[PDB]
Design a protein around this ligand. Structure first.
Ligand SMILES: Cc1cc2nc3c(=O)[nH]c(=O)nc-3n(C[C@H](O)[C@H](O)[C@H](O)COP(=O)(O)O)c2cc1C
Ligand code: F3S
Length: 1475
């Protein structure tokens, strides 16, 4: 989406504003989307004041007296086209308008020209009429909208695609619909009528993830246009929905409030819902500015900028207990008629640039150079930093964030005023019966307790799904975590922790509406906290989560009465219910079992809701059965306001308190551990885990996580889900209440009747002869390897292991149902032809040894398939095919490989672009036939790459241009992609730099990937890849291997279907990967939708992985996942070996095509009707599972056109295309040429320079060119200006640019300068946006002004001079020099690990802002640092004239005093931070 507003304070209404607003919609076109058509828009809209002039002619013609501004009031209605029905609908608007004591003066048909609509939109166009109304009583402004508010909500109860009120106010009106941005005025002709004038305009361009536009959904709503995604929707809705019967306000009637009956609704969009909510707040007596503050609170904790504003710290301090944030990215632009303003979500995940004139004319929007003011007369150019608002008020004043927020600081105050005022070893078998296992405590609780970090581990979740395994499992194991993908970003929980909180409010929430003067640091509560609170505000009935046998026969009953107990107790005034499995202190064999803490808090939390009661109490789960990081999150997830993990906590006591342990602590295990530390660590480790899981979905506050239900259940049947966990997706639908009962019986059996010695071990984490199955295991994989090494008896073996396999994945429930005769193997397409569909999967050169990695690439290339460079860059040297191979099978060019033919090439066909952009370099991008944007990997969806430091050798450091010692945790988001349009910006960046290369986007299965993919398809991707929760890593958290992600059978299926229904399926080829290792696997993914197939772990095995599962360790015994030379030298493994493995897999495929009866894999894809559910299988835990979700897909028998994709998607005609057209291909092919060119840039010119840079790079690579092209530019520059810029490529921007300047900058220079015609302070004025120098690898950028957030985010080696910046300066920085000549936001440190930064922060306050976790703040001491500073501070002035540059240069000796140098330890001892 594109949003913005325009306001005129110092004029009376004109048409030009409207003209300007329309224009700007136009300049937002790329931030929006189209439909099957490529013609109809995902929607465009504009909010203005009532064009009271234009409506003139209406009254005139009817000889009717026009009412006062304040007393007219206008509905824009959408009505059915069919005449009888239009009148049914008209008579109703009027009927209900009549029902408040208002009169109708009639109706204006709205002149429109349907002829410009695209076909889908036209087909679908409601009939549009404005109704004019008045109050005979003499109602006006506040009372009249307030009335019209009640009114549109009533009309809303009958809302349809055909029948919808856009707006109904005496102050504001909305013209919107399903048009492409510039068409908006062609359609509605009023907007081109000069009689249309407004003091403002809120405009919005929509981007939808579908193809099928519905007019009410276009969007400025009644109050706000909203660009972003609510990422805690289901929560926020659920809480509001519970406020709804108990709404109480200032005189507002219990009948009028009941009239907004349901003000919030699951079915509607995050925007409809937000607008609606925002409305309630406003109409009930707050100003849109304040309502937005309540609902999308700033991040106030730790904010240097709040020093002298303690009022507002108390505003959110207060509201924080009442209203949890509507989280996710968001630029909110809204109007009242009375006020127009904009404000950002807390993290500021959407750009907002604004401009002010001498006349206090203001323009805000997602992009800079958009409305075309006269530069000579601009007075500010700024931007909203995270949380900030800016408004305008009818009484002629602009209103910057500080007033603003104080203005609701000032009133209702009590703020800080009222806030102030507010033994044996039974342990061994409790453990056994609450379902702990040897691995749970040894491998999970213990590490948390000893090291204070949940455990790392490696490779992927090898084992069957809770519901399909035969081993007992927890109810928790059935919930997989959901995470953010293209549609919103994860946030960085370590580097950006300062924005989160695990606070949790214990009292009942009051009236949100009525600010009356009338808390838990973390969700985790220790025996102390527990009792403290059983003192507290109120008494707190325990409810026996427990229940005795026979009598109360069933868990069903116990559930029932729990709920009833719970309901009754809350009625009886109970304000907290501690749901204990430890009721009165004990847990017996005859206290025969429990209610699982999860199934309990769920039931209470929904049944309370169903009861009207949830706002009344808040809930503590007091449980043995919770210890896991995931466990807590499932609890806070389905309702727990907090958790006392009593028996977990105990297992730290029993562990520490034990000879074995104390002994090893006396020598061995770090005995830096009094029990107070084990304990403080156990929990501190749970906190890091809740942070992590939240950020996987980009959520800041546990407060938001809490309602929401950020999981996807897999294996729970419908009634169970409805009953306990209402509105969670469970598409496979398994378990019953009894079904779950039986399972808790399985581990109740074994602590009581049985013998309590040591808890059993099911090799869940790690292959064991006794225990849970594993698709891969060391013995199985040694025989596979020996098979391939030959060219037989092993596959009998290997194939055997494969047989004794139980049910594991969902594909295992399914068999085939050929619809044709079997066929001759000789008919079937060749092995060589299947192999082209195979892919080896982008495993990081870091993670694997180069022997292992280069091998896969040679082998993949041989097969005419492709291999993939994961996220660690590729060594240039591979880019060349090999001559040097000799008789022996070695090559001087790669002396460490073996068995190389003279035809070989180790260059990766796919080159990855991942969050850290480690090797991401112009030649890099040009070296690949395809480009992969890695949104997530299967082992760890909401998270970044990890590579522990052990593994970062000098080689790797050189490749990634990061520092040798140092661990690399890449950022969870691409700082580059905060929304789908953002995705579309990067796809376009890449199409731009190397037009020839198909761009894939790699997504992980989860409910919702379908919709996301529709977007990815609209965003111009060439390939989508679905990756199951299944797949491998060489380092991830154990929790995430085990608890984040969904089966790729759901991933592939859902994408394939949604893409088909949207008619986008042809736009994209699908890859799947996730524990595929078998011809059958391949065939099943083809039936399911996939056209290409990816192999990580088996390709590894085939080269000699055993399955040590020690990948994070750097010990692979086998030379595969280590950097250690010693170990690498042990790498047996030859391209031939994997070449063979894939032929095996192909041959295996051919024969399936034969049983089946088709010649070619091309014939089978998505032929889902060929699948049936298996006769054999029955599981231990449920009768069966519904598989509608994999069986029911678009019939593919005859429509197979979708299987034809264009060869590569185009960015279309681009300014570079021309740059590269004139006497320029001489300055290139004649290697040393000076060229100059100047052009005017408008902000649809995006990624300018980039293509020329690819073009140079494709022939000279990164540094072969000693020419010099100077490109000078004029105007406002769109996204990604001067991306991937190269040496002797100089870029002049006269004006301003937007986000991503110098993204991936490699070399050369980029100078950006105001237009001289300015009478403003460059220093004090924004000239560049967020995320500049993103993965900068070289180059120098110079910028006369302030810059956005994340400046130089993962800067590896680029240098820059700018004059001010937002937050997160230097975020993940790793090298280079960054010089900033003006103030800066907070987190100035985060993860910066190498390179130098110098600031100059005269307010003296810098060190308050700086991220203290790693960097250090020096004053300049080493003369060589001054020399470094000067040289840039000078070159800046040489490149610009920078008034601020010149000032400091002639006062070199003054300002130079305190003015900080940021040193990462790692730079401590260089010539420029010592001596
Ligand atoms: C050792 C190792 C390293 C990996 N590195 C990356 C990575 O760099 N980027 C990425 O997207 N996926 C990475 N993955 C995952 C693969 O790209 C692929 O999605 C996955 O291995 C498929 O799972 P599978 O092993 O079950 O076949 C890695 C997996 C492993 C085995
Ligand atoms: S599991 Fe990993 S540590 Fe080794 S044998 Fe395989 S590469």
């Amino acid at each position: 989406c594109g949003v913005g507003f325009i306001a005129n304070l110092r004029g009376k209404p004109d048409h030009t504003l409207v003209e300007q607003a329309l224009k700007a919609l136009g300049c937002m076109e790329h931030r929006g989307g189209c439909s099957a058509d490529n013609d109809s828009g995902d929607g465009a809209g504009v909010m203005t004041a009532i064009p009271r002039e234009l409506l003139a002619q209406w009254f005139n013609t009817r000889n009717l007296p026009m009412p006062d501004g304040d007393r007219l009031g206008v509905g824009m209605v959408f009505l059915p086209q069919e005449p009888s029905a239009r009148e049914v609908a008209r008579a109703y608007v009027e009927e209900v308008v009549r029902l408040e004591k208002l009169t109708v003066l009639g109706w204006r048909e709205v002149p429109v020209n349907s002829d410009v609509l695209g076909i889908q939109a036209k087909n679908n166009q409601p009939h549009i009429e404005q109704i004019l109304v008045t109050c005979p009583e003499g109602c006006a402004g506040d009372e009249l909208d307030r009335r019209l508010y009640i009114a549109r909500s009533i009309i809303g109860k009958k809302l349809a695609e055909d029948f919808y009120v856009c707006s109904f106010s005496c102050r504001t009106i909305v013209y919107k619909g399903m048009v492409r941005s510039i068409i908006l005025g062609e359609f509605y002709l009023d907007l081109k009528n000069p009689g249309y004038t407004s003091n403002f305009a809120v405009y919005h361009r929509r981007f939808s993830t579908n193809t099928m536009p519905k007019w009410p959904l276009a969007q400025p709503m009644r109050l706000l246009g909203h660009n972003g995604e609510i990422n805690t929707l289901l929560g926020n809705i659920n809480w509001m929905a519970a406020r709804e019967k108990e709404l109480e306000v200032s005189g507002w009637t219990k009948a009028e409030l009941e009239a907004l009956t349901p003000i919030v609704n699951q079915a509607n969009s995050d925007s409809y819902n937000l607008d609606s909510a925002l409305e309630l707040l406003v109409r009930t007596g707050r100003s849109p500015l304040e309502a937005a503050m309540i609902l999308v609170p700033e991040a106030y904790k730790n904010q240097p900028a709040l020093k002298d504003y303690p009022e507002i710290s108390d505003f959110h301090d207060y509201y924080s207990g009442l209203q949890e944030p509507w989280d996710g990215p968001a630029l909110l632009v809204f109007s009242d008629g009375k006020i127009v303003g904009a404000g950002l979500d807390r993290n500021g995940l959407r750009p907002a640039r604004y401009c002010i004139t001498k006349d206090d004319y203001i323009v805000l929007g997602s992009e800079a150079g958009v409305v075309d003011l006269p530069e000579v007369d601009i007075v500010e150019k700024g931007r909203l930093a995270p949380g900030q608002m800016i408004a305008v008020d009818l009484a002629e004043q602009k209103i910057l964030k500080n007033y603003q927020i104080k203005q609701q600081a000032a009133q209702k105050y009590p703020y800080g005023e009222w806030i102030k005022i507010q033994d044996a070893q039974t342990v061994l078998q409790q453990q056994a019966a609450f379902g702990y296992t040897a691995e749970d405590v040894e491998m999970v609780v213990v590490p948390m307790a000893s090291q204070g970090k949940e455990p790392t581990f490696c490779m992927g979740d090898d084992t069957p799904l809770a519901v399909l395994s035969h081993k007992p499992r927890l109810l928790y194991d059935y919930f997989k975590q959901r995470f953010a993908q293209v549609t919103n970003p994860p946030i960085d929980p370590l580097r950006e922790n300062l924005v989160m909180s695990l606070a949790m409010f214990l009292g009942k929430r009051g009236n949100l509406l009525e600010p009356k003067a009338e808390k838990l640091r973390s969700p985790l509560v220790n025996e102390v906290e527990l009792q403290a609170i059983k003192t507290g505000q109120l008494q707190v009935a325990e409810v026996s989560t427990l229940y005795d046998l026979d009598g109360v026969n069933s868990l069903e009953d116990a559930l029932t009465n729990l709920v009833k107990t719970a309901i009754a107790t809350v009625q009886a005034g109970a304000e907290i219910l501690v749901l204990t499995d430890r009721p009165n202190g004990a847990i017996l064999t005859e206290n025969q079992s429990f209610i699982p803490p999860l199934l309990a808090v769920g039931a209470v939390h929904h049944h309370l809701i169903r009861a009207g009661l949830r706002l009344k109490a808040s809930l503590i789960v007091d449980t043995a059965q919770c210890w896991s990081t995931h466990h807590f999150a499932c609890l806070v997830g389905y309702g727990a306001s907090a958790i006392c993990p009593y028996l977990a906590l105990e297992s730290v006591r029993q562990w520490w308190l034990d000879e074995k342990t104390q002994k090893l602590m006396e020598n061995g295990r770090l005995d830096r551990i009094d029990l107070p530390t084990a304990l403080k660590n156990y929990r501190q480790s749970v906190e890091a885990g809740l942070f992590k899981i939240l950020s996987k979905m980009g959520i800041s506050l546990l407060a938001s996580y809490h309602g929401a239900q950020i999981f996807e259940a897999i294996g729970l049947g419908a009634e169970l889900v409805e009953y306990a966990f209402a509105g969670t997706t469970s598409r496979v639908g398994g378990l019953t209440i009894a079904d779950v009962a039986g399972e808790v019986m399985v581990f109740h059996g074994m602590a009581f009747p049985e013998m309590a010695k040591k808890l059993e071990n099911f090799g869940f984490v790690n292959y064991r002869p006794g225990g849970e199955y594993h698709m891969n295991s060391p013995e199985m994989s040694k025989s596979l390897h020996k098979a391939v090494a030959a060219y037989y008896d092993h596959y009998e073996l290997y194939r055997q292991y494969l047989k004794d396999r139980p049910v594991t994945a969902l594909r295992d429930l399914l068999d085939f149902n050929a619809d044709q005769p079997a066929i001759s193997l000789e008919e079937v397409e060749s092995v060589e032809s299947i192999v082209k569909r195979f892919c080896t999967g982008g495993m990081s050169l870091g993670a694997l040894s180069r022997e292992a990695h280069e091998t896969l690439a040679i082998a993949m290339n041989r097969l005419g398939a492709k291999s993939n460079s994961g996220e660690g860059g590729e060594d240039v040297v591979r880019y060349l095919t090999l001559d040097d191979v000799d008789s022996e099978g070695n090559s001087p060019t790669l002396p460490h490989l073996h068995g190389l033919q003279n035809g070989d090439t180790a260059n990766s066909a796919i080159k990855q672009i991942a969050s850290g952009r480690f090797g991401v370099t112009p030649e890099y991008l040009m070296s690949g036939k395809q480009l992969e944007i890695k949104m997530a990997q299967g082992a760890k969806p909401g998270e970044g790459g990890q590579l522990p430091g052990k593994k970062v050798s000098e080689y790797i450091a050189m490749l990634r241009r990061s520092k040798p010692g140092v661990t690399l945790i890449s950022p969870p988001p691409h700082h580059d992609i905060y929304s789908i349009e953002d995705l579309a910006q990067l796809i376009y960046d890449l199409h731009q730099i190397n037009p020839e290369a198909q761009v894939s986007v790699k997504l992980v299965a989860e409910i919702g990937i379908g919709t996301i993919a529709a977007g990815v398809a609209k965003a111009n991707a060439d390939i989508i890849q679905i990756s199951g929760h299944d797949g491998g890593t060489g380092a991830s958290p154990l929790s995430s291997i085990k608890h984040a992600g969904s089966p790729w059978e759901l991933g592939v299926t859902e994408v394939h279907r949604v893409l088909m229904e949207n008619q986008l399926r042809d736009r994209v080829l699908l890859r799947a990967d996730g524990g595929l290792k078998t011809g059958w696997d391949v065939v099943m993914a083809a039936l399911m939708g996939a056209e290409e197939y990816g192999f990580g772990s088996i390709a590894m095995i085939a080269e000699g992985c055993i399955m040590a599962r020690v990948c994070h360790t750097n010990n692979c015994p086998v030379g595969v996942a280590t950097q250690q030379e010693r170990l690498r030298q042990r790498f047996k493994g030859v391209p031939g070996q994997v070449v063979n493995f894939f032929y095996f897999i192909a041959e295996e495929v051919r024969s399936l095509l034969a049983h089946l009866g088709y010649r070619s894999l091309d014939d089978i894809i998505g032929r889902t009707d060929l699948l049936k559910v298996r006769s054999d299988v029955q599981l231990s835990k449920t009768q069966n599972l519904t598989l509608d979700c994999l069986l029911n897909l678009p019939d593919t028998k005859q429509n197979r056109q979708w299987l034809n994709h264009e060869p590569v998607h185009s960015n279309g005609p681009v300014l570079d295309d021309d740059i590269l057209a004139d006497p320029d291909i001489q300055e290139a092919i004649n290697h040393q040429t000076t060229a100059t060119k100047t052009y005017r840039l408008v902000n649809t010119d995006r990624t300018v320079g980039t293509r020329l840079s690819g073009a140079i790079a494709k022939k000279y690579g990164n540094n072969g060119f000693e020419g010099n092209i100077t490109l000078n530019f004029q105007g406002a520059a769109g996204q990604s200006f001067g991306a991937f810029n190269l040496d002797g490529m100089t870029l002049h921007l006269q004006g301003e640019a937007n986000d991503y300047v110098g993204k991936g900058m490699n070399g050369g220079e980029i100078v950006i300068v105001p237009h001289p015609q300015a009478s403003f302070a460059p220093e004090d004025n924004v000239i560049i946006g967020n995320t500049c120098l993103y993965g900068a690898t070289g180059g120098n950028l110079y910028a006369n002004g302030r810059a956005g957030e994340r400046f130089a985010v993962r800067n590896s080696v680029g240098k820059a001079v700018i004059e001010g910046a937002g937050d997160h300066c230097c975020e993940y920085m790793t090298g280079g020099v960054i010089v900033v000549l003006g103030p800066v936001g907070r987190n100035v440190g985060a993860g910066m690990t190498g390179g130098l930064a110098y600031f100059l922060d005269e307010v003296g306050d810098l060190p308050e802002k700086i991220n203290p976790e790693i960097i250090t703040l020096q004053r300049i001491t080493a003369s060589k640092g001054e020399e470094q500073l000067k040289s840039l501070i000078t070159a800046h002035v040489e490149h610009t004239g920078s008034p601020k540059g010149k000032a400091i240069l002639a006062n070199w000796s003054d300002y130079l005093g305190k003015f900080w140098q940021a040193v990462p330890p790692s730079e401590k001892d260089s010539p420029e931070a010592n001596n």
